[PDB]
Amino acid sequence: HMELVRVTEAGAMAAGRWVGRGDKEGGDGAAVDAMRELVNSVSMRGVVVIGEGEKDHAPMLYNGEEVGNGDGPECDFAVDPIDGSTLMSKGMTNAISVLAVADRGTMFDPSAVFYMNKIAVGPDAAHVLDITAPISENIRAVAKVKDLSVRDMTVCILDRPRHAQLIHDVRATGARIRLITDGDVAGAISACRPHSGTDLLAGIGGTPEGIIAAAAIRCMGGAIQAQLAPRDDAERRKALEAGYDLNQVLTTEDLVSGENVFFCATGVTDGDLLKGVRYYPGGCTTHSIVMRSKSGTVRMIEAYHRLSKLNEYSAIDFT
Amino acid sequence: HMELVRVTEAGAMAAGRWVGRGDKEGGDGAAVDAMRELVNSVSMRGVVVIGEGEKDHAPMLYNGEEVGNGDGPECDFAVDPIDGSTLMSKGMTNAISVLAVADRGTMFDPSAVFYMNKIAVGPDAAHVLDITAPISENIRAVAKVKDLSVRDMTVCILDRPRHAQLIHDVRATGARIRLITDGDVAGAISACRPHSGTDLLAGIGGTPEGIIAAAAIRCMGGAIQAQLAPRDDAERRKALEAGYDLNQVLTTEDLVSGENVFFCATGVTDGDLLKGVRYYPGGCTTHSIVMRSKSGTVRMIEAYHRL
Amino acid sequence: HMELVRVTEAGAMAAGRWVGRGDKEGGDGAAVDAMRELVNSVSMRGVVVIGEGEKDHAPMLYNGEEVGNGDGPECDFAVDPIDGSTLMSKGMTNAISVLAVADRGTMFDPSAVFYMNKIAVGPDAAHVLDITAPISENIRAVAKVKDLSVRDMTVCILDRPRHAQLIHDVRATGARIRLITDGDVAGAISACRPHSGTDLLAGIGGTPEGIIAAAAIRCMGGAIQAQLAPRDDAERRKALEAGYDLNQVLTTEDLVSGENVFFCATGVTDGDLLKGVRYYPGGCTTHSIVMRSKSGTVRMIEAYHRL
Amino acid sequence: HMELVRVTEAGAMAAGRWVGRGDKEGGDGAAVDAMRELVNSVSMRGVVVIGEGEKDHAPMLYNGEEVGNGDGPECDFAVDPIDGSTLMSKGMTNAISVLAVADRGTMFDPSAVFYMNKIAVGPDAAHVLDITAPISENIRAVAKVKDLSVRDMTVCILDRPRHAQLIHDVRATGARIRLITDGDVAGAISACRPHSGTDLLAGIGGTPEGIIAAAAIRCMGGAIQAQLAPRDDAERRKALEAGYDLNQVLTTEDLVSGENVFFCATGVTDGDLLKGVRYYPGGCTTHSIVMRSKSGTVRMIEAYHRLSKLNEYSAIDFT
Ligand SMILES: O=P(O)(O)OC[C@H]1O[C@](O)(CO)[C@@H](O)[C@@H]1O
Ligand SMILES: O=P(O)(O)OC[C@H]1O[C@](O)(CO)[C@@H](O)[C@@H]1O
Ligand SMILES: O=P(O)(O)OC[C@H]1O[C@](O)(CO)[C@@H](O)[C@@H]1O
Ligand SMILES: O=P(O)(O)OC[C@H]1O[C@](O)(CO)[C@@H](O)[C@@H]1O
Ligand SMILES: [Mg+2]
Ligand SMILES: [Mg+2]
Ligand SMILES: [Mg+2]
Ligand SMILES: [Mg+2]
Ligand SMILES: [Mg+2]
Ligand SMILES: [Mg+2]
């Protein structure tokens, strides 16, 4: 179902006009609108499971909203218009626009708790992860199964005060850290991609972002392990009376359980996997990735969009 | 509909298992087989107007064969499972696998005349083409528009005895030549893409190949011009009381006039446009180009298939 | 002399062993060490005019240090072992290792004033620059020359409190911004290279970094303009009775006036110009750019070193 | 000694003006002249060991001619201005311009015999070659040591009537053939390059070309084995009374024996390793490879040559 890439293409192109303009909500809204317009044109019967929030504080792509033209089987729809609106609003690297689709009911509930602790690797270390052990243990286990020196392991980590210990422990291990200021959907995918220069994603980030990353891991190979991370005892009580086993280790398939899973993403700014939107006299280029669990096929898709006429402008070159 | 790339992806993956094995027919047939299998699983209602040939000497993708499951409007379908299967069999560069789709009835008749004189150039210099003028004047006007000296120009020409005069005339002007043994669909698309190393395509080649190239040009921009080139007086006989004016310059739209044109190609061997199929233990990678006329969107598609 | 790439190759290979380890000084020092070791083995007679700083608080590549074995004429030498070592330490993109060489005495004084307001653009639009005009008018004139809308433009600006007004004014016009935390040598070279995603560099940054960028621009084309930006009245004091007119617009040649200018850089981490150093069992690959003013030849150099 | 790449850059740029122009001698002469002018500017003390012939039928770069500015140690110089002038003159793929430099006296004598039988592989099969065994044996041995299926082996072979048996035997093995019409210096290097799509070069080609390929193999890793291949009994007698053991198997180090070996090459037409000369409004690009035995460093060098003024033209983009 390659056509879904046009949804993240439209989101990235809409957000491209807000890159560096210091207005996170302006580019968010632009991306959301462009993506909803395109997803309703697609032959698919979606319900927004991960979106912009719930029916009020989210005017569009709210949790529960129906999407697609009506035609198609009913499925779960997850969208992150920009994974890290602040990267977009400041014009820094690695902002991406994201969607995932899976069988109806197979996506974990993103409202369970705001945060989850995470660790993710690529397929050749997919069975040695233990999110309950310290990071040094995970690093050494991944290092050995990969036959690498620990000092050549690279761990992607959100730069946050709450990660002071995790960062220290990775360094004391001797491994390296790629500090990111936002975007652990992108950081999760780079850990799982075979030869990307990051071996591991570790740390607490958003629960919706963990689920969307699980969808991509479901298609691409690898594993993420996660645990819900209540912010305080109030939120801990909520998740407990809601039925959640706060000791459960969530695996990739726990977060997205369908057998038909689809993921795609388009660069908004230049990143370690996707180039951002680039502008030219005649139009723009987008750079996307598309993948499916059923076939395991992964597609890199570079597109030249004519922002109008034919023969009016020069031809277009693609790296 | 992007899904149509899987047809050339299937054709190339099948043809790539025959690259460099010395068997034109074995690779050609595997490619036909795979593309027919896959085209009948896409949501189209198509009719082959360009393919392997007539129903008798061609069991698959024959003229008139209905392809697709098939939903959608009925439309013209044009396949070239490998544009120059000799390239594939000898392991040479620039073998591609190609299909085009357009509104039903909007493709030129591939059987009017076997051969067509062609000239094709990209968007920047399309406006200066005139296939009735001598090749020297097209070269100098294209070169001027491109801000190149004539000696910077590189003209792609099929290596054939029939092109001795054309080749002499291009050499006389001072331009460089890229002689190709086969494949003037690939050669035409290269003339129209930037930074390909080819600035112009010229000479006589297959009429079906001219039509497929025009479908691509409808999508990515540029222009091809063409004039039917009857082999003998019997074909000129056949051509004129079919109703064809052979002083008529065919433009891109005369060859493919649909408002809804689709084109895609996948590399079989490495070329100046697309990498060829690469195999490895877990799978294979294909490199494709996809384009549509109504949007003008051109897509480069690298696919890692896990077999 | 192409051989000088090995100095930045050595600086980057040393700095790459520190990428992502949280130690600014450890990577910076390893890079200094490796570049000093290697520069003294090339056939040059150079004098560091831009490096690590004064002889007291900088043992290596200090101001005045003679480098090379050394043959050849005496010349100006300028090193930046890592342009923004924070980038290296946090594993962020666009860390490069840089050197420039020019005729002796032809580089501007890096110590006149600490900071310089800059604007830099590539060859196509260099002729429209005016650093005295408002940033909005430079953007619209550059954009027109490039045949871009203003909203297609991407302006690179160091993320600093001092740039709040500049950033507001660029946002007011509608252009996009690429905010960088460090490294306006890399940012300047990116403004001047095509298809980099950056169309313009603007704002205040280090005077030594402006000079190194100008050496590069002397070689690959484009223009930088600059105006000294004294921090306090004491520096304006210092600047004026040094003899500087601070209504004076500095052009590229005012910063580096040699007829013989050399520039090279090697990637430390991945950037919009150069891939970073990649290690593997047998060895490592570096990605470099090399350029000279008298020929204008620009060289991209990928090196597979077997360790 | 990176500056030597400017010699093959000048040869390729001079030959670029003759690509497809149907005049092999015209582009040969242009390349020869441009290369000699640049090599005499280089600080080096060369004697042309492999050149355009001997002092008469070769006006320039003749066997024995001295090259370089005088400064420098004395060394052996081998130059092939275009490896396959017919590829150049017809505008077909894989024409390259080549030079090699080694310690004085360490290059085999290219006049010993016109032809030599050859087989070459990359470093991971460098010890399983036996040029005296049939090709099927070599293919299976290389296939096993590389852990590949034979049917995935690709053998580069000059398309020649004299190779009818060799071609048949490769196919009957099940391996694939990349037929080339000229240029077994380029075909040798592609066999030795690790992931180029050709695994093997086999067959009889020119003796100078085998020696130049040995120089590149000396730097890059791999091995070539060769035997002289007399064209008739007249030539067989010559090589015999000259002292040559016609049964000797020549190894890489027999063909080029120095410990300081240098090789570089520049594309003239587009090839499987180097792009050809490409022209632009402002100038041209060349694509070169440079390597040294002493360090084993291999350099890919893409250069933009301004065929004149600064700021007068557009900027330049490199894949
Ligand atoms: O910004 P917080 O509160 O630390 O939460 C982290 C989350 O924010 C993002 O960086 C951007 O929304 C996500 O990538 C990540 O999951
Ligand atoms: O081989 P012929 O008869 O000259 O016809 C040329 C045609 O053959 C092909 O090389 C493939 O059969 C086409 O690319 C080209 O149009
Ligand atoms: O960090 P400051 O004081 O604003 O100075 C900016 C300078 O710092 C650097 O980021 C590196 O120190 C340079 O690229 C830049 O010119
Ligand atoms: O052309 P011949 O006589 O078969 O000899 C082969 C030689 O010719 C070349 O193809 C070009 O001179 C060389 O690459 C090869 O060594
Ligand atoms: Mg997010
Ligand atoms: Mg990885
Ligand atoms: Mg064909
Ligand atoms: Mg700096
Ligand atoms: Mg030769
Ligand atoms: Mg190989």
Residue numbers in the entry:
A (entry chain A), D (entry chain A): 0 to 318
B (entry chain B), C (entry chain B): 0 to 306
Question: What does the report in the manuscript say about this coordinate set?
Answer:
Mtb fructose-1,6-bisphosphatase (MtFBPaseII), the enzyme encoded by the glpX gene, is the third component of the glpFKX operon involved in the growth of Mtb using glycerol as the sole carbon source. MtFBPaseII catalyzes the only unidirectional step in the gluconeogenesis pathway of the pathogen.
In addition, we present structures of F6P-bound forms for two variants of the active-site residue Thr84: an inactive (T84A) variant (2.3 Å resolution) and a partially active (T84S) variant (2.2 Å resolution), the enzymatic properties of which have been described previously. Although the T84S mutant was co-crystallized in the presence of the substrate (FBP), only the product (F6P) was found in the active site, demonstrating that the enzyme is still active, as has previously been observed. One Mg2+ ion is found in T84S MtFBPaseII, coordinated to a glycerol molecule and to Asp79, Asp82 and Glu208 near the cleaved 1-phosphate group of the substrate. Although the serine-variant enzyme has significantly reduced activity, the hydroxyl groups of the wild-type and T84S MtFBPaseII structures superimpose at approximately the same position. The hydroxyl group of serine in the T84S variant structure is rotated compared with that of Thr90 in Ec­FBPaseII, perhaps explaining the lower enzyme activity. In the two variant MtFBPaseII–F6P complexes (T84A and T84S) the C-terminus is ordered (although with high B factors), with a malonate molecule from the medium found bound in the center of the tetramer at the interface of two monomers, occupying a position near the location of the AMP allosteric site in the Synechocystis enzyme. In the T84S mutant, the O7 atom of the carboxylate group of malonate is 1.1 Å (0.8 Å in the T84A mutant) from the O3′ atom of the ribose moiety of AMP. The T84S mutant also has a glycerol molecule in the active site of chain A near F6P.
